[PDB]
Amino acid sequence: DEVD
Amino acid sequence: FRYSLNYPNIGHCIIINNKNFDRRTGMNPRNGTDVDAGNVMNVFRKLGYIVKVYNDQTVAQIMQVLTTVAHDDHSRCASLVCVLLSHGDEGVFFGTDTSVDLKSLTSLFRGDRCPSLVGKPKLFFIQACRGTELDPGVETD
Amino acid sequence: AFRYSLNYPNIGHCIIINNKNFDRRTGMNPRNGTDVDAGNVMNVFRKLGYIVKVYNDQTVAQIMQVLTTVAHDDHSRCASLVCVLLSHGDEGVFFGTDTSVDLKSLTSLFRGDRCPSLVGKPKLFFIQACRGTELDPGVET
Amino acid sequence: RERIPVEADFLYAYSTVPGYYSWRTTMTGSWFIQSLCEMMTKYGSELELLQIMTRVNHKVALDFESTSNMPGFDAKKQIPCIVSMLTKEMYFTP
Amino acid sequence: ERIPVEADFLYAYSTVPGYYSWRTTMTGSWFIQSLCEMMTKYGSELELLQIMTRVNHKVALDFESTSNMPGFDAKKQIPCIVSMLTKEMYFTPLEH
């Protein structure tokens, strides 16, 4: 999981 | 009441899909956004929207794209869908080059700027960051 | 479950913040007719089962005391919470009788990590206040 | 047990759009609150809250238009702004 | 009749103002993949605000972040549905  | 679908076209679906950004920004690639864009395209195409995807758009490109859509004739369109996939911050959406205010994008279709769509639903779906807070969650039952 | 449960002794409390008269040397004109708003709302939510309390002409600090106290009570027996905010406002801010406060500061009192007994339960804010000075000209269909 | 977002299950029903003025009459009250109370009365025991608020949006948008003999403020309109972080349907009667 | 120029917009945001928005590695953002699965499941049955409520639920319940980045582990998300719609929105003439 990673962010925008 | 409900929005009438009694039009020839349910409407257009514009997808703005930004994966790779200007190295001067330092924003990391958004890997997997092509998965999002393809899923959206498939979904809305199956309900009769005419789907157009614009990839890796700069702020100014985005603006010209949407200004063109605004200024088109939608008298036969029941609705408009716009999906925005990029990085973001509080109130802004990143082109590949820098940020722009979201209000600037969406106001192009406001009732007095886009008469072809008055009274029809203008539907935006926005996948972008809106800040840097993190939600820790809370346990419930 | 597709529906918030109503299987609680009480459907919950309704806190009304009703601001009519403001500090003169701020230049804010009274909100004449806000008393009919508050009585109308009170009656609507009273007949739905809510326990209604009305707080007139609260300062920012007093609003915080009121809502901080509500947030720290026990709502085990309550299905929901309603909060009606009637005052002047600006973009992102709500006016006490004295000055402005961030709405985020009011609403965050009931965040799930700070208001445990309202976790998983609808928290319903209705906010009558300006959000800026822009005026909507309208458009003929 | 399960974890949920700390910001979940909020509804922020704003009388107006971000950046815009909000209209009220001295005699009948707020355009928005008056319309809220009307639709809650008609539909509170039958409809889901987001559906109610959409009908409130219809009433405010169609039924009201401003008047002020400061004509830069005259003949204006208003649409409310329903912000939902709700994860379930809200009915006021079981 | 005159209607407000701001009317009949919907802004379905993936996340709450001020907050980060989450993706999986390469299985799509949480919000968009939940949106697509609820559109697929209900687009011919529910109206748009009913769908987006079930999107909010699916994002709020089925996702939690896994990260080795300090301070980003086990985080949650809820989308933010901003409606200035004045009517129900269905995507099919007859809902089934």
Author numbering:
A (entry chain F): 2 to 5
B (entry chain A): 38 to 178
C (entry chain B): 37 to 177
D (entry chain D): 189 to 282
E (entry chain C): 190 to 285
Manuscript text:
Caspase (or cysteinyl-aspartate specific proteases) enzymes play important roles in apoptosis and inflammation, and the non-identical but overlapping specificity profiles (that is, cleavage recognition sequence) direct cells to different fates. Although all caspases prefer aspartate at the P1 position of the substrate, the caspase-6 subfamily shows preference for valine at the P4 position, while caspase-3 shows preference for aspartate. Zebrafish have two copies of the caspase-3 gene, called DrCasp-3a and DrCasp-3b.
We first examined changes at CP-N162 by mutating the residue to Val or Thr in DrCasp-3a or to Val, Thr, or Glu in HsCasp-3. CP-N162 forms a hydrogen bond with the carboxylate of the P4 aspartate in caspase-3. In addition, the smaller side-chain of CP-T162 could potentially hydrogen bond with the carboxylate of the P4 aspartate, or it could increase hydrophobicity of the S4 binding pocket, depending on the orientation of the side-chain hydroxyl or methyl groups. The rationale for CP-T162 and CP-V162 was to determine whether increasing hydrophobicity in the S4 subsite would result in changes in substrate selection. In contrast, the CP-N162 to Thr variant of DrCasp-3a demonstrated no activity against VEID substrate. The hydroxyl group of the Thr side-chain forms a hydrogen bond with its backbone amide group, which presumably stabilizes the turn in active site loop 3 (called L3). Thus, it is not clear from the structure why this variant has no activity against VEID substrate and a lower catalytic efficiency against DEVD substrate.
